[PDB]
């Protein structure tokens, strides 16, 4: 029997800052126990200061990203070059995904950017289009290895202030872009060690009011 789906592995990570956002993802592409490419870009700049990644089955991922980019283009034509806000992009993506509700895009989609008040934003989608704005979201193969670490080190979960002994929580202080990138890199380094489908390279896209910037880092190739 023909199986139209596949698993190209990979892992992605979106983190929303106070006035910035990052969307990171490893550059390894795989099938089963074989490596297809050590550098196959997964996170894309879609214009209008939005970055997107559709992780899972690469064919559906590429199709969705292509269709969303196309949606941004036609939004400009139809509405007098109006900038597509991140919240509007998110709703538009829901409809793209739910459009194939009964033959889904087999991907866990994440977009990142800035909201209309200039604050950092990350949106997270399941394969059939259920979505939510979030502060922190890892997706893909090593998502289960990364999220608990982020709950602890970003939201300071289970951490309390010494001396009080469980009475006072650690205060939720804001993280700088340099501080976030450290957590992103350590998440992927750790994920590379313990997950076979994660490695080769890490590509991070950082979104600010100034625009989209890229950063690449080597990962273990075994």
């Amino acid at each position: 029997q023909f199986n139209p789906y596949g698993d190209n592995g990979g892992t992605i990570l979106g983190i929303a800052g106070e006035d910035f956002a990052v969307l990171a993802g490893d550059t390894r592409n795989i099938t089963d126990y074989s490596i297809n490419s050590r550098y196959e870009p997964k996170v894309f700049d879609c214009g209008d200061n939005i970055v997107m990644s559709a992780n899972g089955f690469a064919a559906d991922g590429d199709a969705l990203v292509k269709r969303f980019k196309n949606s941004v283009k036609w939004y400009h034509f139809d509405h007098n070059d109006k900038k597509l806000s991140i919240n509007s992009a998110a709703r538009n993506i829901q409809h793209l995904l739910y459009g194939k509700r009964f033959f889904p895009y087999y991907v866990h989609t994440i977009i990142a950017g800035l909201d209309e008040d200039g604050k950092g934003a990350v949106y997270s989608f399941d394969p059939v289009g259920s979505y939510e704005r979030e502060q922190c979201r890892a997706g893909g193969a090593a998502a289960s290895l990364i999220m608990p670490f982020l709950d602890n080190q970003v939201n300071f979960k289970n951490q309390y202030e010494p001396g009080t002994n469980g009475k006072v929580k650690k205060p939720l202080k804001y993280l700088s872009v340099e501080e976030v990138i450290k957590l992103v890199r350590d998440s992927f380094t750790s994920a590379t060690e313990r997950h076979i489908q994660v490695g080769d390279g890490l590509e991070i896209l950082i979104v600010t009011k100034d625009g989209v910037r890229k950063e690449f880092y080597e990962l273990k190739r075994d």
Binding site: N36, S37, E40, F57
Partner: protein, 233 residues
């Protein structure tokens, strides 16, 4: 949904400093039967692209005709059909990739793994993969089927990353490819000795080599091997 009937095995390829090399044996298998020994599985499109195809041969022949039709269509009302508006590898690939994914989405795939190798207008090496699922990826070395498991490891010792491409000459790259084809002949039960090799260079253009053979094979050591454990005679 179908099942492949007459099949072609590995297609292997790699980038080098001035272009790309691609190779594929001349066998059309019918299950375990090595039915057709004169099947060309590298199909050149113009003078700047070669599409290597593995998998179902009837679907390959269909793709072959689509490309032949693509060239015809590109020439229509196109005074620059042999110049600025000639077909690029990136155009040819994107077209196939669209078709492959559309077909999988109608649950009626072209049962193939395709590698489009070529050189662009600006001299850039083009090497990208697409298969029956519409999955695409690019890499300094690309291989289908058994090639992915045996050829890539060998080819990656030559070009392990992007920065190794300018350091690799056409003689070193062709040597690696020809060796990989020998390794596949040793170890792939659906391969043949006869194969075709194509080089697309930005300077010397398209060089298409037919009727090549795997040579310099090591078999002499077989005479010493006896039994399966305890047997001496």
């Amino acid at each position: 949904t179908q099942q492949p009937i007459v099949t072609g095995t590995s297609v292997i390829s790699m980038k080098y400093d001035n272009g790309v090399i691609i190779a594929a044996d001349n066998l059309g298998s019918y299950g375990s039967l090595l039915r057709f020994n004169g099947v060309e599985r590298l199909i050149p499109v113009g003078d700047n692209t070669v599409v290597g195809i593995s998998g179902d041969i009837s679907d390959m022949q269909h793709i072959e005709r689509l490309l032949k039709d693509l060239v015809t269509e590109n020439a229509y009302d196109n005074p620059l059909a042999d110049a600025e508006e000639a077909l690029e590898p990136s155009y040819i690939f994107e077209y196939l990739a669209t078709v492959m994914y559309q077909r999988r989405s109608k649950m009626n795939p072209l049962w193939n793994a395709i590698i489009v190798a070529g050189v662009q207008s600006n001299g850039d090496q083009f090497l990208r993969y697409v298969n029956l699922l519409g999955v695409t990826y690019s890499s300094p070395t690309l291989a289908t089927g058994f090639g992915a498991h045996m050829a890539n490891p060998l080819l990656r010792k030559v070009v392990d990353r992007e920065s190794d491409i300018p350091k690799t000459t056409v003689q070193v790259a062709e040597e690696a490819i020809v060796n990989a084809m020998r390794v596949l002949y040793y170890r792939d039960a659906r391969s043949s000795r006869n194969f075709s090799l194509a080089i697309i260079d930005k300077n010397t253009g398209l060089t298409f080599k037919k009727n090549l053979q795997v040579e310099n094979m090591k078999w002499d050591f077989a005479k010493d091997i006896k039994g399966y454990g305890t047997q001496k005679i």
